[PDB]
Amino acid sequence: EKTRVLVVGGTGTMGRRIVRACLAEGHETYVLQQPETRVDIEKVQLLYSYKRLGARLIEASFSDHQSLVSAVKQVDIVVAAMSGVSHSILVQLKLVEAIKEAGNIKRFLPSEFGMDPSRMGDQKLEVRNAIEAAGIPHTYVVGACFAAYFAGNLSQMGTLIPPKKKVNIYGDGNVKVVYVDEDDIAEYTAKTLDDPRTINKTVYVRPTENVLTQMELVQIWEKLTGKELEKTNISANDFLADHQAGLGHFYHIFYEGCLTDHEVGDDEEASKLYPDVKYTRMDEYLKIFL
Amino acid sequence: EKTRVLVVGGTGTMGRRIVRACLAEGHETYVLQQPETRVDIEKVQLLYSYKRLGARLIEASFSDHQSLVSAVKQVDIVVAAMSSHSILVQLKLVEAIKEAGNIKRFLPSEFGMDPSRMGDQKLEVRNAIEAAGIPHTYVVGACFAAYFAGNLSQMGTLIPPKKKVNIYGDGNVKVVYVDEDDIAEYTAKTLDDPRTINKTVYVRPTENVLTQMELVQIWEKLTGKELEKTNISANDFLADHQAGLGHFYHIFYEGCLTDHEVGDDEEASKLYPDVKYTRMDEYLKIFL
Ligand SMILES: NC(=O)C1=CN([C@@H]2O[C@H](COP(=O)(O)OP(=O)(O)OC[C@H]3O[C@@H](n4cnc5c(N)ncnc54)[C@H](OP(=O)(O)O)[C@@H]3O)[C@@H](O)[C@H]2O)C=CC1
Ligand SMILES: NC(=O)C1=CN([C@@H]2O[C@H](COP(=O)(O)OP(=O)(O)OC[C@H]3O[C@@H](n4cnc5c(N)ncnc54)[C@H](OP(=O)(O)O)[C@@H]3O)[C@@H](O)[C@H]2O)C=CC1
Ligand SMILES: COc1cc(C[C@@H](CO)[C@H](CO)Cc2ccc(O)c(OC)c2)ccc1O
Ligand SMILES: COc1cc(C[C@@H](CO)[C@H](CO)Cc2ccc(O)c(OC)c2)ccc1O
Fold first, then answer.
1. Which processes are annotated in GO (biological process) (chain B) (predicted)?
2. Is residue A113 domain-shared with residue A214, that is, in the same domain?
C-alpha cells in the first residue's frame, strides 16, 4: 500500500534527513549501502541505525552497473543526495542509466536542494538533461539556503556558530535570501516525491517568514542575545578576488539575489503545497546557540 | 544533589556515548567545545544535539590555560575521551585540574587494553594524574564490539562476512567483546562511586567473555549457515604499519585481555548488576 523509496546518499548531511523523513511520512524506505571505502564507523552505525526505524539496506557499487539495476528494480522511487560541493554529483549519470534500463521507477528526484542550476547567476543541469532525455518522471527540489551553512553562522564563512563580536555584511545586507532548516527540506522532499501536483515539476522551498535579508537574520540574532554586533559592510568588488570554500555561490545568493528575485506560485511552493509542515523560523533555529 | 561531569572528547566515538550516559544517569553534564578545526557539520551539530537533552557546552582551548582552568572550576568530575599526539594533550588538562583542584575525580582516557601490561602514552598520563593528587578511576579492559564483534574480528570491515573467515591462531583465545554503550554506562556509574575511587575499574561482563571461534559461531547460528574458515598462526601473523596490528596480536594470540582475572570488587558487571549489558547474540542481530 506504500510508496517504496530508495534514498541514495543516505548517510550524508541532507541524505540522512531524507531517510528519516521518508520513514516518518510512512514510506517503505530504502537506503543504498555502498561497498565500504575504509574503516568508517560513523557511516556504518548511521547505516544500521536505519533498520531499527523500519528501513532496509540494498547493496550496490556504482562501479557495478547491474548492481544498480538490482537496486532500483526493488523500489518505486529513487531520491539522490550525494556530494555536490563537481564529479561527485555526476555519479548520478550512472544511476540514471540504471533507472532507465529498469523502467519500474515512477519518479526520480536528483540531488538539488538549493540554488536552481537552470538559471545563470553547475553540472547538475547535465543531470537534469539526462533524466528528461530518458524520460524519467522527476521533481526538482530547489531554492533554499541550508540553515546550518548560512543562518547559524549569520552567513559568515569558515565557521558554523554565531559570532560574538563582529559580523561581515555583503552589500548592505538587504538582499533577501531563503534560510531553511534542512529538516524541513527533507519533509518537503518526502511529501513531494509522490504528490500528483509536483511530478515533472520544480518544487520551490520558500517558507514565507524565512524569506529574509542577511541584516534581518542578524537582527534576529541581536534581538535574541541582546547585543549589537560590530557590522562591516562589504561591496561586490571588495568581495571579488580574481580558492576559498565556494565564493561564486555566496556572491549570487547574497549580492545578486538569485534565490528571491523571481517570485513563485502557491502551486509550486513547498510551504503552500504542504501547509501542514510547521517549518522552523530562524528566531527558533538560532535559539540553540544562545 | 549530583556531581558535575565535564566530558572531554565529547563528539568522539566513546565521548558521545559518555555524554549521553552521564545525562542518562542524571549528571549535570558539560561538554568541552573546542575552537573549530574546520567547517564540521557533524562535529558542530553533535555538540548542539547535547544541549537539547540538558547538557551544557563549555568553550575552552588547549592553546589557552585558564580556559581549561575556568571550565574545570565548574564541575565535580571530568572524564576525557580522546583518540598518538591526541593522548598527550591530557597533560595540559592535568595541569588545569591540578591548578583548579576543585576536582573530586578524573577518569582519564582508557577504555581499551590496559597499557600497564608491557607486552603507551596513557601510562605517561597516569603517572601525571597520580603525581598531582587527582582522585581517579581507569576504565579498562574492553574490546570495542563495533570494532571487533560486528566484523567478527575481521580486519578492514565493520560488518559480518558472508562465506570466508579469518581466524587468529586456533581461535580458542578468549577476548573481551563489549558494545561501547555499556562501557559508557559503566563509566557513568563508576565516576562518583566511592568503591572505585583511585582504582582501575574492569569491564569484562561474564557472558561476553568469548573466543573468536565462539563469536564466529554465535553468528553462524544466527544465519543458519557456516563459514569457510581460514586459520592463521603466530609466525605467519607477524609482518615485518597496518592499523596497529600489535593490538590484534596481544589480544588474539597473547590473550592479554584475559590472561588474568579480576576481583568482582573491580569488575563493572559485578559492581553494576543493574546494567543489563548486551550479549553478542543481540548486538549481532542488527546486521542480519
Ligand atoms: N545551502 C544549500 O542549499 C546546500 C546545498 N548542497 C547540495 O544538497 C545536496 C546534498 O548534498 P550534501 O548533503 O551536501 O553532500 P555530502 O558531502 O554531505 O555527502 C553526503 C553523501 O553523499 C555521498 N557521497 C559523497 N561523496 C561520494 C562519492 N565519491 N561517491 C559516492 N557517494 C558520495 C555519500 O552517500 P552514500 O555513502 O550513501 O553513497 C555521502 O555519504 C547536493 O546537491 C549539495 O550540492 C550542499 C551544501 C549546502
Ligand atoms: N577496542 C577498544 O576497546 C578501543 C579503545 N579506544 C579508546 O576510547 C577512547 C575514546 O576514543 P574514540 O572515542 O573511540 O575515538 P576518537 O579518536 O574518534 O575520539 C574523537 C574525539 O576525540 C577529540 N579529538 C580528536 N583529536 C583531538 C585532539 N588533537 N585534541 C583534542 N581532542 C581531540 C575530539 O573531541 P571534541 O572535538 O568533542 O573536543 C574528537 O571528537 C580512547 O582513549 C581510546 O584509547 C578507542 C578505539 C577502540
Ligand atoms: C544554495 O545552494 C547551494 C549551496 C552550496 C553551498 C556550498 C558551496 O560550495 C558550501 C557548503 O557545501 C557553502 C559554504 C561555503 C563556505 C563556507 O565558509 C560556508 O560557511 C559555513 C559555507 C552548494 C550548492 C548549492 O546548491
Ligand atoms: C582493545 O584495546 C584497544 C584497542 C584499540 C583499537 C585501535 C588500535 O589502533 C584501532 C583504532 O585506533 C582499531 C582498529 C584496528 C585495526 C582494524 O582493522 C580496525 O578495523 C575495524 C580497527 C585502541 C586502544 C585500545 O586500548
1. lignan biosynthetic process
2. no
Same domain, B76 and B212: no
Instruction: List, in sequence order, every residue forming a beta bridge with A230; answer none if it has no partner.
Output: A166
**Which residues pair with residue A33 across a beta bridge?**
A59
A61: left (phi over 0), alpha (psi -120 to 50) or beta: beta
Residue B170 to chain A, least CA–CA distance (Å): 26
Q: Does ligand 3 have an atom closer than 6 angstroms to the CB of A30? A: no
Q: How many domains does chain A have?
A: 2
Q: B183 phi and psi, to 5 degrees?
A: -45, -50
Report yes or no: A160 at the B interface, CB cutoff 8 Å.
Answer: yes
Distance CA A203, CA A5 (A): 18
Resolution value, angstrom units = 2.6
Task: Based on the fold, state whether residues B11 and B46 are members of the same structural domain.
Answer: yes
Nearest ligand for residue A185 CA = 1
Domain of residue B2: give its range: 1-140+180-202+261-272
Are B212 and B85 found together in one domain? no
A153: nearest CA in chain B?
B39
Same domain, residue pair B44 and B29:
yes
Residues A150 and A244 in one domain: yes
3-state secondary structure of A44: helix
In this structure, the residue with its CA closest to atom 37 of ligand 1 is A9
Instruction: Give A-chain residues touching B146 at CB under 8 angstroms.
Output: 41, 44-45
Q: Which three cell numbers stand for residue A271?
A: 510551504
Q: What angle do CA B144, B148, B152 make, to 5 degrees?
A: 145
Are B189 and B277 in contact by the 8 Å Cβ rule? The answer is no
Q: Are residues A41 and A131 in the same domain?
A: yes
Is B223 at the interface with chain A, CB within 8 A? no
Looking at the fold, whether B152 and B214 belong to one and the same domain comes out as yes
**Which of B39, B147, B243 is facing A160, going by the closest CB pair?**
B39
For β-strands A230-234 and A56-59, DSSP reports them as unpaired
- Say how many CB pairs under 8 Å bridge A and B: 45
DSSP A229-254: -EEEEE-HHHH-----S-HHHHHIII
Q: Which of B2, B104, B122, B221 is catalytic?
A: B122
User: What DSSP line would sit under chain B, residue for residue?
Assistant: ---EEEEESTTSHHHHHHHHHHHHHT-EEEEEE---SS--HHHHHHHHHHHTTT-EEEE--TT-HHHHHHHHTT-SEEEE----GGGGGHHHHHHHHHHH---SEEE-S--SS-TTS---HHHHHHHHHHTTT--BB--B--EEHHHHTTTTT-SS-SS--SSEEEEETTS-SEEEEE-HHHHHHHHHHHTT-GGGTTB--B---GGGEEEHHHHHHHHHHHHS---EEEEE-HHHH-----S-TTHHHHHHTS-TTTSS---GGGBHHHH-TT-----HHHHTTTT-
